[PDB]
Design a protein around this nucleic acid. Sequence first.
RNA 1: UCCUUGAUGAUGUCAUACUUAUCCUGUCCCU
Lengths: 167, 569, 347
Amino acid sequence: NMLNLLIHRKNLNYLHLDYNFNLKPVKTLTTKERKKSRFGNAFHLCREVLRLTKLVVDSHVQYRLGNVDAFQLADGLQYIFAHVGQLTGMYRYKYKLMRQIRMCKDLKHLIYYRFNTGPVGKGPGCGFWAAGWRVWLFFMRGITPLLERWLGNLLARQFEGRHSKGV
Amino acid sequence: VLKQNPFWWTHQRHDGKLWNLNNYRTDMIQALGGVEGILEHTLFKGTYFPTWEGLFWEKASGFEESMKWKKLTNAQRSGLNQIPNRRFTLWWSPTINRANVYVGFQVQLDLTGIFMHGKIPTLKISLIQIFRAHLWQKIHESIVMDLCQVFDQELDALEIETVQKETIHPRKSYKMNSSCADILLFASYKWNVSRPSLLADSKDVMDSTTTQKYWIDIQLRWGDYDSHDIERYARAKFLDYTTDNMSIYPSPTGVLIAIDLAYNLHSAYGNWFPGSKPLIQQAMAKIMKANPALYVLRERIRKGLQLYSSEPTEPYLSSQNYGELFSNQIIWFVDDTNVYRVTIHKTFEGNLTTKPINGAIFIFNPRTGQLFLKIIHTSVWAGQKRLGQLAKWKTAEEVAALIRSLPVEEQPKQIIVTRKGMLDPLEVHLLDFPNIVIKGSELQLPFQACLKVEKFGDLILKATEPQMVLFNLYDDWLKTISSYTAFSRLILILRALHVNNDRAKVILKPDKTTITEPHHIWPTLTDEEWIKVEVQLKDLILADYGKKNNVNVASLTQSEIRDIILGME
Amino acid sequence: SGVENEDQQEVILVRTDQSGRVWPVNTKRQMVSTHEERERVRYFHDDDNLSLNDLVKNEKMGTAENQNKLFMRMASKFMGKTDGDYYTLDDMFVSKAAERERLGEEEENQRKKAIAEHRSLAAQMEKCLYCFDSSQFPKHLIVAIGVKVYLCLPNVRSLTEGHCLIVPLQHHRAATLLDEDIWEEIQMFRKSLVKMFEDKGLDCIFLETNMSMKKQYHMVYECIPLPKEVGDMAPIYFKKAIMESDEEWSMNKKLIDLSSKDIRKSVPRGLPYFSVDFGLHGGFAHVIEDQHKFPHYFGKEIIGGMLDIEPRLWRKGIRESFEDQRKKALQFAQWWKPYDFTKSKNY
RNA sequence: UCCUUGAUGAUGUCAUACUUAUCCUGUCCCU
Ligand SMILES: O=P(O)(O)O[C@H]1[C@H](OP(=O)(O)O)[C@@H](OP(=O)(O)O)[C@H](OP(=O)(O)O)[C@@H](OP(=O)(O)O)[C@H]1OP(=O)(O)O
Ligand SMILES: [Mg+2]
Ligand SMILES: [Zn+2]
């Protein structure tokens, strides 16, 4: 609701934010409409963070609906945290996240080799999402002030206005 | 000179080349994997060339030409600086666009089953141009229709009632998540099917009989280097699509067929009912080499790659085929050699000028002996008469209109052409008749010489109105000999007419009491007399070939003599 | 089809492609609607007019460009700037799918292409030395006449003694563009000229230089006799000089061998190919890219260097007396009396 | 019961010559 109230206050009726936080144009845009509707790293960071959380919460919703499993929930969460850079696309709008992404890959190499040891083969079957969970919460610990400042200046420019030659 | 050279210390006019790197190139190929291992990183399979040998690249017709020499304003080369790189980026596209090379969000491409990892600069334009005008949907519904029409002709060999094509929403071809049903079968009593297996498996029929219901699905993927194993893909999509709730099938006892557009691989995984796996094998093998939509795919890929090939073509009639001329099919020879014929004369200024003469289209049956002579009058050449080239198109148009007027019983199965330039117009003008195979001949025939006969020439030169005239060049031969004996006799006669054209007439008419009939072309002889004149015309062919090539005919082997007389070595 | 009455006449409007096939030619942007309810359903303006058989037809008739027509339009001025990411040349190409200006596509194709091709061809025909009914056409350098090809002699000082040419009647621009009936008759003149120069103690080198195939140059098949003590050293010169021709780090692997493959099934229909054949044995061929690092002569220069001739012969020629010195045709015609195969009226 | 100033066949029609939303990339002629 927040992201498309930001869309509808900017009168960008030709954009559409779907329910999985993919922003697509409804029609084919002119040059003026395309320059008007270019967003920045604040909007797309908030949109991709909300994509990651909706992936997590929907995994839990399909567990709570009776659709999936306990074990398949654990392995789905372990995939989500091992593959944020492949499921979301947060890296495009802040690149330093590769530091986190590679780290999760390293943990996936550390855990699986200890997990797939004996009779257990190379199937999916491994939900040990504590490590990737810690890595993506420690990311959020530092991305909270950066995004609060960026979204604050975004809202302040939308509601106060831009100061042309003020600074 | 403002340019700096690194070869400042030598010159090849004086010192020579001083380095040679062909051993380097040779074991560079052998180190990368060989040509076979290199070309699996490429779209070579998507071009569907049989071999790689005579492939020539063609940077002479790209955008870097007459325009882009003097475009000027070098800020042009700021957005359009990646346009020389497009062809390259197309060619190695199964390795640029991998999962394991770009860790990325991996969006789907527009109306395709193509996924683009990352934001490769010119790849998306190339993929839009190759799948221009809804080619995924047309490829999918052309394969569904082909497999249905395969099932529309094998009813009373299997247990059937009626195959039925679902008209589902069109937006299922480019949907990797789930599918619906590409055809539904309707068996008479029951099918004890087998179990799920592959398309290239051997045996083992078994479990439950599942009356009236049988589905196939058709999945078109766009493989990359990492994932183009079509069998593992087919079984994975089967086990995912049959055991989920988003995709619900009529029966649990059907097959899906996976086709990789990038590599031209195909396979299947499902419940095979008896006498269907060796049917679908032959069917899919036929469809992967005759489908007109895959043809547009392949030609658009080659088109975008600008990559050509002399040495392979469609497989000709060249030498070893020719026994297949005399099967139970309707085969035509078409010859347009004498269509646009010209005679040159001098004017009062002295300068030589060109006036046309009436031509003909030579259609011959090599399995009955029936002839179609289409006399092409001068009054269709009112409109160019300086260069020609519309000869090919008027010939193809008249052959197409003749097959159009001809009943469906005598329609050809193969049309075998003497001049290869006709292979492309007929292929256009016979799109109304898809079952006609058009095949070229390396084996050149003397069918131009048939109009050297006085009856044909006096018919053509004195005409003033286009007419279709019928003949039989096997005059009464089929009462005693076979079609191929009569055909080899006719090739001997026409070749001897092409070589000397008068000594053949003297030898075939040595006596006034030897006669010929007005219903027929050649004199009436008993079979011993035919053996005599066949040996004589064989001598006329061989002696003049040896004279034109400074060789003796008493040393030539039987295969060499056959190649001299019948075709060309 | 199209008519276009060129100053009195009638010409059937046709287009040639790369492969030399000749097809009959039948006869503010509004940003159409390249979506639906929220979903994209077509890219260009005519993705629902074309059927599958129509795509097969337009793939066969369609010339081998399809990138160039779009890149010409989106290369021009007043058209923004690719700002790195978020607006590349990819989505610029998606945005340029306008609604072409009421058969303006067929108009530009027909008018540009048909008229341009005809205009160029007419000019070439008018000033062609060959194609009998032309303007220049010496007409006394004719020695032979065949069914479809003829011998000629060059209009200039003629590099060697029995220098001759094998020219077809019509413009055909290549040997790979020839039909088999013309090609088998060029091979008969070739096998007769070899037998004429072999009994005279000479040797034969048959050149075929085919430059860029869109300026419509007439086909001419060289024949340059040089003495046998120099023609046994002739594949060495051409083998050295083909590989020290064209743009280094080329693609197509220079010096195609033609020992038993005889360019008809060696070089694809469409792309330039210099070729040289030594007598009756086929020699070499070189697919030409980069039309500036390869001279339009190239063969008379190698032959003219191994015979130590001045460069005014091979480039630009030296003219002769317009009837008097050009009666080497008289000398050539008494050479080509025993080896004439084009007549039988010699009673 | 007002009110303000002039530059030597013309005028019209038809024909000929000179520049494109539009693009292609270069050769003649005599001793
Ligand atoms: O293809 P491999 O080199 O053998 O590696 C794969 C890959 O892991 P890496 O990313 O570390 O290479 C898979 O993940 P992705 O390919 O999807 O990134 C992973 O499975 P997940 O997808 O579940 O991570 C899989 O693990 P496994 O084979 O145990 O299922 C693992 O193979 P290895 O485990 O043999 O390294
Ligand atoms: Mg700018
Ligand atoms: Zn000409």
